[PDB]
Every structure is written in C-alpha cells, then in structure tokens.
Write an enzyme that holds these catalytic residues in place. Sequence first.
Site, mmCIF file in Angstrom:
data_model
loop_
_atom_site.group_PDB
_atom_site.id
_atom_site.type_symbol
_atom_site.label_atom_id
_atom_site.label_comp_id
_atom_site.label_asym_id
_atom_site.label_seq_id
_atom_site.Cartn_x
_atom_site.Cartn_y
_atom_site.Cartn_z
ATOM 1 N N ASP D 153 -50.522 -37.356 8.774
ATOM 2 C CA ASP D 153 -49.068 -37.178 8.654
ATOM 3 C C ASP D 153 -48.465 -35.816 8.509
ATOM 4 O O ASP D 153 -48.717 -34.992 7.782
ATOM 5 C CB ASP D 153 -48.623 -37.977 7.413
ATOM 6 C CG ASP D 153 -47.221 -37.982 7.030
ATOM 7 O OD1 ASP D 153 -46.465 -37.414 7.763
ATOM 8 O OD2 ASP D 153 -46.920 -38.422 5.790
ATOM 9 N N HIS D 180 -48.308 -37.272 13.512
ATOM 10 C CA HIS D 180 -47.037 -37.947 13.540
ATOM 11 C C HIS D 180 -45.821 -37.080 12.890
ATOM 12 O O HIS D 180 -46.155 -36.639 12.010
ATOM 13 C CB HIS D 180 -46.859 -39.225 13.270
ATOM 14 C CG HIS D 180 -47.131 -39.700 11.960
ATOM 15 N ND1 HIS D 180 -45.958 -39.538 10.745
ATOM 16 C CD2 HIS D 180 -48.139 -39.982 10.878
ATOM 17 C CE1 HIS D 180 -46.645 -39.811 9.490
ATOM 18 N NE2 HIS D 180 -47.530 -40.157 9.658
ATOM 19 N N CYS D 191 -40.007 -41.059 1.838
ATOM 20 C CA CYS D 191 -40.729 -42.092 2.340
ATOM 21 C C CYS D 191 -39.763 -42.685 3.125
ATOM 22 O O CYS D 191 -38.615 -43.269 2.689
ATOM 23 C CB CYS D 191 -41.417 -42.593 1.168
ATOM 24 S SG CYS D 191 -42.198 -44.523 1.729
ATOM 25 N N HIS D 193 -39.071 -45.864 3.360
ATOM 26 C CA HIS D 193 -39.012 -47.023 2.669
ATOM 27 C C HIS D 193 -38.285 -46.731 1.335
ATOM 28 O O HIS D 193 -38.005 -47.446 0.257
ATOM 29 C CB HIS D 193 -40.010 -48.153 2.261
ATOM 30 C CG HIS D 193 -40.593 -48.663 3.745
ATOM 31 N ND1 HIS D 193 -41.774 -48.231 4.033
ATOM 32 C CD2 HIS D 193 -40.059 -49.145 4.682
ATOM 33 C CE1 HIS D 193 -42.219 -48.666 5.126
ATOM 34 N NE2 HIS D 193 -40.892 -49.240 5.528
ATOM 35 N N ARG D 228 -41.820 -40.310 14.911
ATOM 36 C CA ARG D 228 -41.283 -41.220 14.110
ATOM 37 C C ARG D 228 -39.823 -41.155 13.888
ATOM 38 O O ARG D 228 -39.091 -40.028 13.615
ATOM 39 C CB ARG D 228 -41.760 -41.282 12.666
ATOM 40 C CG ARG D 228 -41.110 -41.619 11.570
ATOM 41 C CD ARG D 228 -41.768 -41.928 10.230
ATOM 42 N NE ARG D 228 -41.153 -41.937 9.149
ATOM 43 C CZ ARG D 228 -41.552 -42.121 7.964
ATOM 44 N NH1 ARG D 228 -42.680 -42.136 7.521
ATOM 45 N NH2 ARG D 228 -40.711 -41.894 6.860
ATOM 46 N N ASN D 313 -46.006 -49.526 11.386
ATOM 47 C CA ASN D 313 -46.308 -49.197 9.895
ATOM 48 C C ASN D 313 -46.382 -50.461 9.244
ATOM 49 O O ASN D 313 -45.152 -51.173 9.079
ATOM 50 C CB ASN D 313 -45.417 -48.179 9.172
ATOM 51 C CG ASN D 313 -45.703 -48.276 7.722
ATOM 52 O OD1 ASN D 313 -46.656 -48.780 7.340
ATOM 53 N ND2 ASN D 313 -44.734 -47.316 6.990
ATOM 54 N N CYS D 314 -47.532 -50.956 8.984
ATOM 55 C CA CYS D 314 -47.447 -52.257 7.973
ATOM 56 C C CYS D 314 -47.676 -51.844 6.622
ATOM 57 O O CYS D 314 -48.652 -51.648 6.110
ATOM 58 C CB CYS D 314 -48.807 -53.096 8.512
ATOM 59 S SG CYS D 314 -48.965 -53.652 10.358
ATOM 60 N N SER D 315 -46.599 -51.605 6.282
ATOM 61 C CA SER D 315 -46.333 -50.938 4.924
ATOM 62 C C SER D 315 -46.463 -51.770 3.629
ATOM 63 O O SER D 315 -45.923 -52.932 3.670
ATOM 64 C CB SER D 315 -44.997 -50.197 4.740
ATOM 65 O OG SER D 315 -44.791 -49.595 3.834
ATOM 66 N N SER D 317 -45.177 -51.069 1.218
ATOM 67 C CA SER D 317 -43.744 -51.115 0.424
ATOM 68 C C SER D 317 -42.873 -52.364 0.694
ATOM 69 O O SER D 317 -41.844 -52.612 0.119
ATOM 70 C CB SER D 317 -42.692 -49.988 0.983
ATOM 71 O OG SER D 317 -43.391 -48.778 0.611
HETATM 72 MG MG LIG Z 1 -45.552 -39.727 5.055
#
Ligand SMILES: [Mg+2]
EC number: 4.1.3.1
Lengths: 427, 428, 428, 427
Positions: D153, D180, D191, D193, D228, D313-315, D317
């Site tokens: 990240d 990314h 973040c 979310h 992203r 992203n299978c988050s 959150s």
């Molecule tokens: Mg991050």
Amino acid sequence: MSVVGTPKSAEQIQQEWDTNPRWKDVTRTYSAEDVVALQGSVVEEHTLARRGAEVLWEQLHDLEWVNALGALTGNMAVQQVRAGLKAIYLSGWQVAGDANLSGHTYPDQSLYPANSVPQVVRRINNALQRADQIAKIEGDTSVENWLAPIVADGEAGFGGALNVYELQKALIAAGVAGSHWEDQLASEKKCGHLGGKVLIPTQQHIRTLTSARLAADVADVPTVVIARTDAEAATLITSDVDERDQPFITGERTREGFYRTKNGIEPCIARAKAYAPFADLIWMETGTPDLEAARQFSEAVKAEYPDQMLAYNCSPSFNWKKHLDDATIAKFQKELAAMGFKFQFITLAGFHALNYSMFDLAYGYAQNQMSAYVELQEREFAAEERGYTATKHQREVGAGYFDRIATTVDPNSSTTALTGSTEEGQF
Amino acid sequence: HMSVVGTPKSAEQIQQEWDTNPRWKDVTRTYSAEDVVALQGSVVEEHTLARRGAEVLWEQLHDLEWVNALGALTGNMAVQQVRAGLKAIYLSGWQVAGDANLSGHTYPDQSLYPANSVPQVVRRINNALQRADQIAKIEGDTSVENWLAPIVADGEAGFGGALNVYELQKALIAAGVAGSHWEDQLASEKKCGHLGGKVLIPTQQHIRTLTSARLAADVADVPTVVIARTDAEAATLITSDVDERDQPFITGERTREGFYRTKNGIEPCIARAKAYAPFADLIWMETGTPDLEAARQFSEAVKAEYPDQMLAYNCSPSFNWKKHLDDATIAKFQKELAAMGFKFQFITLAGFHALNYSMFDLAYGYAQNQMSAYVELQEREFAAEERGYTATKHQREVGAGYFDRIATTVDPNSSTTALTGSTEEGQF
Amino acid sequence: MSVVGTPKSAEQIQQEWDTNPRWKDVTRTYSAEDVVALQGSVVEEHTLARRGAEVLWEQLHDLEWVNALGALTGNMAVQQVRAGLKAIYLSGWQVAGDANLSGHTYPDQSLYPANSVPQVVRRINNALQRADQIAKIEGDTSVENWLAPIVADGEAGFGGALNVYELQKALIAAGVAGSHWEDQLASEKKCGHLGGKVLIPTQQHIRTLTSARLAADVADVPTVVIARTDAEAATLITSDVDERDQPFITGERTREGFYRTKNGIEPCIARAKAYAPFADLIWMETGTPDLEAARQFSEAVKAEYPDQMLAYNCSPSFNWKKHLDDATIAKFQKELAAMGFKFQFITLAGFHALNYSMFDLAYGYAQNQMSAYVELQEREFAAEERGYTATKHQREVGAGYFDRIATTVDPNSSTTALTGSTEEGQFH
Amino acid sequence: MSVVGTPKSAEQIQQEWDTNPRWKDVTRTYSAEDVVALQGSVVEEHTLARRGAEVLWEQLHDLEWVNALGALTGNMAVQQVRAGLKAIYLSGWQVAGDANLSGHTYPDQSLYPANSVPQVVRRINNALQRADQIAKIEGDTSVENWLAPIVADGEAGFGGALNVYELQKALIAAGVAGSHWEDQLASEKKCGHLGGKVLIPTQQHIRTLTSARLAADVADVPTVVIARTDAEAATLITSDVDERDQPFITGERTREGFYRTKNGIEPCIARAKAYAPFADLIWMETGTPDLEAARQFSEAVKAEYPDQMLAYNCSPSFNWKKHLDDATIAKFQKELAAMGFKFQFITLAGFHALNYSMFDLAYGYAQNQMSAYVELQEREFAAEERGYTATKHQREVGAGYFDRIATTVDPNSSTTALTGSTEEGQF
Ligand SMILES: [Mg+2]
Ligand SMILES: [Mg+2]
Ligand SMILES: [Mg+2]
Ligand SMILES: [Mg+2]
Ligand SMILES: [Mg+2]
Ligand SMILES: [Mg+2]
Ligand SMILES: [Mg+2]
Ligand SMILES: [Mg+2]
C-alpha cells in the site's frame, strides 16, 4: 515460476573456487555443496557488495597501497571520494561514539545494537550514489568512481559464530566491500588501544573467519575478509584448550577465571600465521607507530605466506609527534606499503574532524558571532579551487537531481527548487 | 489501592496555570482546559528534558541579551557547541534531510524524509549531552554549568494536516525538545526558505498548525516554545485564495496545478506575522539577504501591534555574507538584531558546512601527503586544549571512564576495565 | 538553571532503602553514594516504568497470583488487558521469531539487535495508552487499569555487565515494569527448552543481577528484577572458578574449552539460593510441567528464604494432554500459586495465536474464499458480549480519538473520519 | 573501474518497451533517455522486486484470479503461503494500527512515518526466505514458490511526486511486486470506508502514477502499478483546475477552500478511464459488497480498455451477512473474477485474525488458566492434517537451519540448538 535469482550449482561454485585467482590462497573447511544447501530457492543479488569487493581486490593489487579515512556520516564519505580517496573505512569506534542505533554515546566496547554498522554501510553507499547521480546530470567527471569500496568493522562478532554470520550477511546486504574481525571475547570487546582486552583461543577466531567467509559465499559475493589480532597488548585469554596458545599461558588466573598470557609481537606472529589461510588481509594492533616493528611483523608473516597482504592502523590513539619526527611521519604510509601493508586507514579521522571543527566554530561563534562563521565560509570559497563543492549546499544534497525528477514527471511544474533560490543568485 | 503515579491534573488546575503563570501571558488558546484533559487518558507521562529545556529556554530568552545557536546534526556536534560556551542547540531539518534522516538517503530540503527523523536526532542530541554531563560529574569538570542546553527543532510544515502536526510535536516533546518551529508552506511542496518555487498555505491554515502544536504541548503538559515561521517574503504561490487576509496579495491568475500567483515581500510577512502573534512565542521571517534595515522594518511593524513579541532570525549560510556586508557590520550583526527583538538567532547549516569542509580539507591533504595531513589536525586539537577543547582524549570523551565507573561499581575488582593501560593513559 | 530532574541525595536514597519495605530482602553490594555518582546533573523521570513496577509489586502481594500471556504486538497486549489480564509478558523468543529490528526470523539464540525488546516495550505501552485514551472519550470504565505492568525478557544481557546495564536502562526508558535475566553464556544463548546450553559461573550471574539493579537505581525506578537459571538441562559451563559450581563439575572438557557439568533440580536449588538476595522473583526452566518438581524447588528455596517469590513458565514447548489430565491442567496454576509461584506466564502464547489463526483463515480462504472470513467476523460479532470491541476496527485504533483532536483544533473541519464511515452505518 | 551494475542504453530500454508484451498498454510520458539520465553510473539489482513482479504479472494472466490476505507480520505471510495462497497483501491500514515505525497505534490517515510499509515488505520477504530455507533442508516441496509476490500500500504518496517517487523506490528496494496508489489528498488521507475523504484533481493522480512508474523504470524492475480511486464516497476535491473533474463539481465550498463534488460510480468510471493508460490494475473503493455495482464498473471500463485488469477490495469494513446471503458470499470472488477483477484481497484480515484470536485466548485464560491454552494447542495438533507446521515452533523459526550453519562452520560444535530439546522429545 521464474528464473530470477536461480542459485548456481555446487559444480559452478567449485569451478569458480578452482580457477578464479581471487580464491588462490583461500581455505574453506566446508564444501561447495554446504554453501548450496544454505541458499534456499532464491539468491538475492547484492550489486554494491559485489562491485565494491571486486574494485577493492583490484585496487589492492594495482595501486601502491589503498588508504582510507574513518567516516561516520554519508557526507563524510562523499567528501573523502571527492577529495581523491579510493576507499572508505567504517570505524566501529566512531559508530559507538556518534552513529549507532541506540542513540547513545558509547565507548568502543560492543555496547551498541549489532545492526548499527550495516546501516551506516547502507547510508554511505546511498550518499555516494547521490553524489554519483549529481555528477552525471552536472556532467562532472572529476571522480571516476564514486562507489568507492567500504571496509566495515565487524568487531568481535557480537556473540558466537551465528552472530558473526548474521553481521557479515547484514554488511553484504548493505553493500560492504570488506569486513574485519578481531580475536577478542565479544562480551569484553575493547578498542585495540584500550585496556582490559581478553583474547579467545586461536581456533575460535578461525571459526569466526570461517563463518565470515561462509556468509559471503552463501550471499555469493567475493567479500574481502580481514583478520585482526589484539595479542600485542592483551594479557588475558579465555581458555588454554588450544595448544597454539599454550606457549604463552603462564598458568596465573584472575578472579573472573581468565588466564594471563604473555603479550607482544611473537603471539601476534603465531596467530597471524594461523589466520593467514582464512584471511585476505592480516592486521596486528600495535601500541606505537613504529616502522621497525611493522617490518618485523611483515617479514615473519611473509616468510611463510609471501603474498599475504597486510593492513595497518594509523590510529589517532597514538600521539604522533611524541614518537615520530615530521620526516618519519611524511614517509610512514609509503614505507609501510613497501612491506606489504596494502590497506592503511586513520580510524577516528571522522571523530576528530567533526569534534574539532565544530568546537573551533562554536568557540569563535560564542565570542564574535557571525565573524567566526564568515571565516569558515571564506575558507569554503577558497577551497573551491581544490574541487570543493559543498559551498553550494543545495545542489550538493541533490536539489538539481530532484528538480530533474520533478520535470521528468511534469515538465511544466512550477514548484522546482533551484530556480529562484538564493544559491543560483548569490554563488 | 492503585498507583497515583502520573495522575493527570484537573481542568481547574490547568486553567489556574493559564490564568496566572506569566509564561502564558500572551498565549491565545481557542480550545478549553477541559478539552486538554479530555485527551490525556488516565496517565500523563512526565517529559523531564522537554520540561526542563522549555523552562530554561524561556528564561534565557528573557534574561540574556539574546540566545544564539548553531545547527547540529550529530550528538557530538552539540557536545562541542555547549562545551564551547553556547547555551542552545538548533536542530536543522535541512541538515537532517541531507545527512541524518531515517531513510538513509541524501535529500534536498523538501520534506522528503520520514516524519520521525528529527525527533530521533532530538533524542540523540539529548543522549549525547547527558553523556558529557555524566563524564563531567566524575571528572570534577565544572567548565559548563548546564550541559542540557535547550534544543530548538525544525518541525518544517508538519508533514501533512493538523494531525500530522500534532504527532510530530508529541514526538519532539517525548524526545526532550525545548522548542519547535513551524512554517506556512504546503508540506507536499515544502522547500528550504532560500529555495525557489515555494507554495504558501492560507493564513488560517497555519493558525491551525500553530494551534495543533500548542495543543500537543498542552496534552503532554510541557510549556514547549512554539515558533511561527513565514515564507511569504519570497514565495510567489499559494494553494488557495480562501482567506481574506491573503486575498489582497493575490493577482487572480492560476497555474496549471491550480495554485494562485501571489505578490511576495515584507508586506505579506508583516501581515502574517501579526496574524500568527497570538499563537506564537517567537516569530521568524525568512528573508533573501542579511539586511538589518529590512529586519528593523519587520520588527518595528510587528512590535507596533504586539510590543512584547519576541522574534527569531536565520543567519543563513545560504547568504553570501561578505558579498553583502562589510566586516564591521558582520561583527555587530547579531548584536544589532538583538536590540530589535530578535532574541533567538541561529546559523541553520553550520554543522553541514563544518562537517563537509573539515573532512574535505583533511582528505585533500591526506590524499597528497598521507599522515602529515592528520598530524596537523591532531596538533591543532592539542593546541585547542588551552581554549577548553577535550575531544583529543577521544576515549574519555565518549565515556570510557564513565563505563569503567559502572563496571567497578558492579565489580570493584574487575580486571577488564578499558582506560587501564590504554594508549590514551600513556600518551596523552 | 532549572530544578527539574534534580537528583536526590545519597542520604535520601539510603533512607528509602532502609525503610521502604519494597527493598526489605534486597541486597546491594554497591553504595547509595555510588548510585548518585553515576546520575549526572539531571535524572529523567520514567513514569511508566515507575508506575508499572509499583503496580506489579502491589499485584504480586495482593492477588492470589499474577498470570500473563506472551505478546509481541501492541494490539495483542490491548486484547489481553481487554479480556481481563493484569500483566503482560514480553517473550524474547517471540521477538526473535517475528518482531525484532533485524527484520529476520530467528531462533531463540540472542541473534537479534539488543535494543529489540525495549522497542516492543515502548510499542506495547503506546498501544495500551491509546486504548486508555479511547476508553476515556468513549466513557468506557469496564477496565480499571489499561497500563498493565510489562515483564520483559532480558535474555543473558547480550554480552558483559555493561551490556546488561544498557539493556536494563533501555527497558526502563521504554516503560518496563520488570525484567528477567538468565545465567547462560550470551554468546551461545539458547531458549530454556533448547539443547546445547552453556552456563556461566554463579558469581557472573550475581554480577548480572547486580548490574540490573544498579541500572534501575540510577534510573530511580523500583524495577522488578527476576533471576532465571537454566541448570536443569544445561550440561555445559564456561569455567570452574566458582566453588559453588565445582561440586557439579565432572572434570571433562570440550574442544571449545567448556566444562561438562551435572544438570538437574539440585544445581537449580543451589544457584537459586545464591541468586535469592539479588532477585525479587526466581525462576528455573524445567523439562516438563510437573507440580511435584515445582513443589520440590519451591519448598527447598523457601527453606532458606521463606518470603522469596517464584516465577513459573507454563511453556508452549510442552505437550499438556500428553503428560497431564484435564483436571490437573485446570488446577495447575492455582496449585502452583499456593507454593509461592506468584508470577506465571505462557511464553509463546502470542506466536501460536498469530500463526494458527492466520493458517486457519488462510486455509479456509483458499478453499471457500469469502465464506471463510465471514465465519471469523460472525465469531467476532458473537464475542462482543464477552467484552470484545475490535470488530469496530476504526474506533479500536483511535479513529474517534483523532476526530476529537481534529475537532479540538478545528471544530468546523469537514474532513473528520467517523462521520459517514461504513463502520458508523453498518456496525450497530 | 568495474562492469557490475552497468546501466543499459536508452535504445536498449526503448527496445523492451516496444517488444516486451508486459508494456503493451502502458503509456510513458517521459523518454527512455530521461530514465537513463537518472540512473547514475551503477544500477542496483533488486532481485525480489524483479522476481515478484514477474511472478505476479504471470499469475494475473494464468490463474482464474489472484487472491490474498492482509499481512502485518512475517509469520502471518508465512502461514498464508503455507495454506496455499500465491500472493501477500500489505495493508497500510494494518501498518498504521499495529506495525509502523512510530511505535504508536494510528487510524488510517497517513499518520505513520513514510518508510514503514517498505520495512514490512522487507520483513515479509525475510520471513518467506526463512521458510524457503527451512523447506530446502527439510526436503519440503509442498510449496512451489515461498516467495509469493507482495502487493503493498502506497496510500496517497505522503506528499507530492517526489514523496511518491521515494516510497516506490523504497518499496522496490524491499522487494515489492506491486504497489497501489489512491487519488486522495495526502494531508487528509482516509481509509476508503472512512468519511471526510478529499480527492485530488485527475491530472495530479496521473502525475502520481507516472512518478510511481518512473521510479520502477529507474530501478529497472517491472513493478505492477495499481491505481485506486476514492470517488465513490468522497464529496470533496481540492481544486477545479482539471476539466475532467468539473462535470461533478457543484459550486459549493467548505471553509477550508475545498470544492463539493458529486460522488458515485460515474466519477469512478471517468477517473478509471483516465488512469487506465497509467495503471496495470484499477481499483474502485465501494461502500457495500455488491456484484451488480462491480459489473457496471467493469463493463464500463472494459468498453474502452478491453484488456484492463481490475482489483477488488473485499473489505472487513463491510458487514457481510447484513448485505449478502451465504449463497452469494460463497460465489462472491468467483463472480468477480469473471468480470475481470483479477486481484482480490481482504485488507484487514490480519488485524482481525490477530485481535480476535488473542482476545479469545486471553478471555478463557483469565477464566480457566491453562485449560484455555491447551484447547488452542489441541486445535494446532489437529491442524497438522491440513499442513500446519508451527506447532513445532523451534524448527518453524529456523532452529534447524541455524543448526546447519553451525555444523557447516564447525562439525564438532557442542552448542547446537535442536539436539536435546523438548521439540525433538515431545513432538
Ligand atoms: Mg491503505
Ligand atoms: Mg572497532
Ligand atoms: Mg591469506
Ligand atoms: Mg527547515
Ligand atoms: Mg505571541
Ligand atoms: Mg527468552
Ligand atoms: Mg530475593
Ligand atoms: Mg492500463
């Protein structure tokens, strides 16, 4: 998967050991298959460790001798190469005093975290790389090789053979060209010119040197391995098990359980001969700057290992004018090279240059304020004739290089650094 | 029961201190004392060196004619400065970027290094001064009355938003800083004050920074000296035109990036200085030349609205001094500045130039005459002992006798002490 | 010029030693005047070290016993305190394996840099502080003391007496409450349940415990000093100089010069008796978890020092369903406490919890993709009635706490975190 | 005066861009000569960054889809590969919360020092190398590639393009395979979310992606660059200078000077199309796990760029069973792979695995002491059927591997670790 980093076969390593003259006098008590078994599925390439090691080995045979100064910051190493030096010495003493990862000021007794010297190796290469990058865009060809080899301090290994192995591995990852290792008890390590030194048996230091070579073999780089003996002044040994050490054992014992041993040039010769097959260079700590004793040690060693190169510590721990006259000082290094002392280095040069220059500035600054600094700035101006460039401090640290990066990403960026600075308009 | 160590003060205790302690006589806080307590948790750590340093620094700025310092990028550098009689240490972010940051790389002064690099050097400088203080104690050395000189550290632009500002101040306090300075530049485009292509942030945004720095000092319960720097004298760009105090200087045109072209000079510096005053213990105007007249204009204009406001001045090595000034003016420069209210004055890159020049001069002579070059340095060190220099005996300078004292305190009959029989013992 | 951090006089220290019952059974071979001579002019306050040490000593005498689990990340310690534990254990094994400053995975042989464990102490205290702060703004009083005492692994000191001293100093700066030190040769250090262990003479470890106490005294904090002996399995020693170790020397030697020695519970009793005057708790590594073997050691030591507290490692290196039945496992710690083992801990609890839970999730994730993780999150949801809070991960790491800082600096900020988050709109 | 690390010519680089299919759809607004100009005299070889990048790119085209889990410690990544996963995801969120160089616990707002993620990349690679080495001496071939590629990240770059450049360079030096980069204001990074997200103008993120590519080219490695976008939920943008962003700007302003913008899938598609020539994968942050919303994003991007691979992203959150039935949860990743989402990852998996597993143990420990632990130890035993090995923890961390190094140095060493231990006797 991918062929990147595929380990070489034990046959190729054996071939390289048999034919490459770099290994002409290197004994390995482990097999090429033993190296392969420790390399996993991938072997990381250590570019700067390989290049520096090859350049160092080359210079030790081309030049009359290779001399260096101790450097404890990246800028120090930059100025040494800028001034014409072909190698950097990375002093453990200096790291302990002003550049170790605990953040504390230490005497030279292996008190700092074991990964401190590797970080300074990486830091120095980074600074040399930045100087190299700046020279390329500036068209500056004053220096042929900015990535001058680094000779780093392994001290007493910070423990056993595995501690040795991991330090040498860490020094190579950082891009070191050579590392030196001394025959002192790690838990009682001292600077060569401090007291309270405790030797370890001869075989144990061969174990250390073997471990240092093994890590260099596993990482697949011809790292120069240097052996240092502290037997000229040390009167303590951990054990009398090794028969090579017994002729100097007196039988007397300390409350700690150490054995008293007879110090001098003789046990250094004995240990030097024993280390020779496992050392690219040999180094005996001494109490005074004395050419006769240097020739004496050189003769006795070369009488059995004629091509064995030697390293000599031109230590600031000596009061130089107290022993030698000015004429002897002038020829000291050149005469040493005629004896085979092909690597010579002033270990604490960085410490005394840093501590004295700032005291001289601060003291004058306390009395006369700006007048004292103008005095320094004018010396900087005057030194530009000699190739000094750090007066223009913005470009010295890469302002132009990152301006180049910024314009490469966005040619129309209006936030470049050097355009408009007082540097381009006052220097 | 439960340990009372580190029990936080009440809101009323903090308010009493703000109301009656003269330290805060001119300090404006837009947040409450109950807000501070609300962020302190159950235990408030003591920051001995940050507390001592901040108090000594404030006292010195009111008691001495002026406090001056030199940039220091290693612990030994600070030791020599205090040893030589200096009573404060300036920690340059420029120097940290160039030769002492946690990335290991050499950087120009553009906020490229990790945000915790300067705090590490703060802790390092304190550690080094503590070692020299310890050695001095056992050696009976009394040539320095306060080894723990106040440290003023470079907070640059906070490495981001208000929260980045807060954590940087907290980390500087934990390391023992006495004061920290903050500049009104866009962090993502931060520059040395004497580099081109600078981008200002709006006035209100830098009031947010100064407010966050003060808040971090209050939550940590230490009276850290907060210094406001403005780069408006040379910066011709600003991120936004949102602040009506900045709008009179905006031309209206924009760059391809969206920045607004703005008119620079002393006038916007005075305006921003006045706006920062309620939130700044010291104010600092970056300038393009060493000019006493221009310094007086800025001083008188600022002191006309805030007559007790102390100022700070960068005696920058970026200035070619003898190109602009005669020797007489150079000699009186700091003194004249002190009378104008510039009570903290510093040479930012003194360590970079001392280090780079000393090593080059030695390596240049070493490359041509080998040991003859080093003996000159050793003989100079020997000669400097009359003035108070001590690092020639390098073994004791880094504490070999101090750790010998630790060793013999644990084991009086240890036969492995370091200075015993050293070449320093027998040759110096 | 200030009085912050002024050292106490020798008389004050000596009076604390003479009257404070914390030092009732503590032997110091050095003097109170020796401590002062090593303290320079300023003594930093170590708030968390002092508080943690005080709380630890209080819990060892107030609770039936003090149990702990090994933790190698900050979040681990938070969950240990959240779930109700009153103390944290910092395993050196775990640091060597997955949390040391070399970046490498190491077996437990003192291979990592010596300042690694202090860093984790600071990390753990930092994480516990954040939970403490978060709990305050959240009005959460379910946990009385988030700053649980940390007992950290000093291994064999990473060298000589001076290496011991610096490790203890660093652990204290980082905020440790206690540290344990073993009588192994640092050069050949091994985990207690590994082979090839080489002991150091009895007096050399007495010197270690002395240097450890000295570093705490110079730091002016009552750090709990724990003495560990590995003589139950070790068949090697470095020297026969100490007459207390000679009755176990066999007379044989190794190629390295080590002396063969007879292992067993007997040389552990003897070394523990020698260590007693210098240890707040004593610990012997053992080959199996056996209550009677622990009672034999306990009663024997308490025959000479009946008030000596002991420590016990319920090692993961053991195999519990093999040796013991369920009922004995249930009573195990409780019965060990009645024998004087007042600090008990599972060393590698963090290692196993981290490796298994990630393997279990990664394996299920490989076969069933998202179905595997949803089983965890629902298991997380279910744990909320036992006190678990980390399902809401944004608040768990301080998103709300920093919103409070952001709104304190700028209450009109349009860039706060929790308002509009999926955590706010999907986690009730 | 050596050849190691010699940079290649601009035409040699230009040839790779023209012929290697790796760069078929990659736009570079700078020249090959520009790259060579920034490389100095020596170019370090980044073996793991090269091997990992080549493996990742190969997997993305050869596998159904590459999926990974968030890892914040070295042992975590070891277990993920041991269980069959072929990639490691290095979450910046997790680094902020429990593994960054400040020592503090942070929300996901770019608060931690910028070199923190590179350290964990290097750490993860070190752990995987150790498992690779142990597996070789143990004859373990259950895992074909222990050096699984790492996707790390880069957040918003921690500033401008030079900050972006240095993070990518440090990630590569640590051995990263992909990185990314998001179109958020660094000083206000959140973040995906969390609330209060502030977008930067489209061109400014193209500047980021270009800088990230430039650093990878200067390092001479084919790092996978991932773009992203946070436009789905962000209602704020810094400026209106980019006309591609103006069709969503409403005219509203905040007190700080931001511009209100219309969030949703439309600006995500538009920004994606703009990022496509500069991104090896494109990633749209979403507020719910919705397969239909993913199809809209996929088919719209693939209408203009058919071969554009996507990441999802299978988050954690998301509250998964508040939105989806078990039947849809099971097929979620499989359905996404058919739409071109070839890199899928559970970002905070490590945080939740670590935090839950230790709370579960500590809770039972505080209630029933050893009984609680023995339950975990028993579950570890039962897991050996599935390939679990960390129950024998000594060999798991390389006790046997370092025993080999010890006996390779000295066969007759009396200080080996595993002989005489409770691991060889009770396991
Ligand atoms: Mg991050
Ligand atoms: Mg040394
Ligand atoms: Mg030889
Ligand atoms: Mg600065
Ligand atoms: Mg004011
Ligand atoms: Mg341990
Ligand atoms: Mg006792
Ligand atoms: Mg594309």
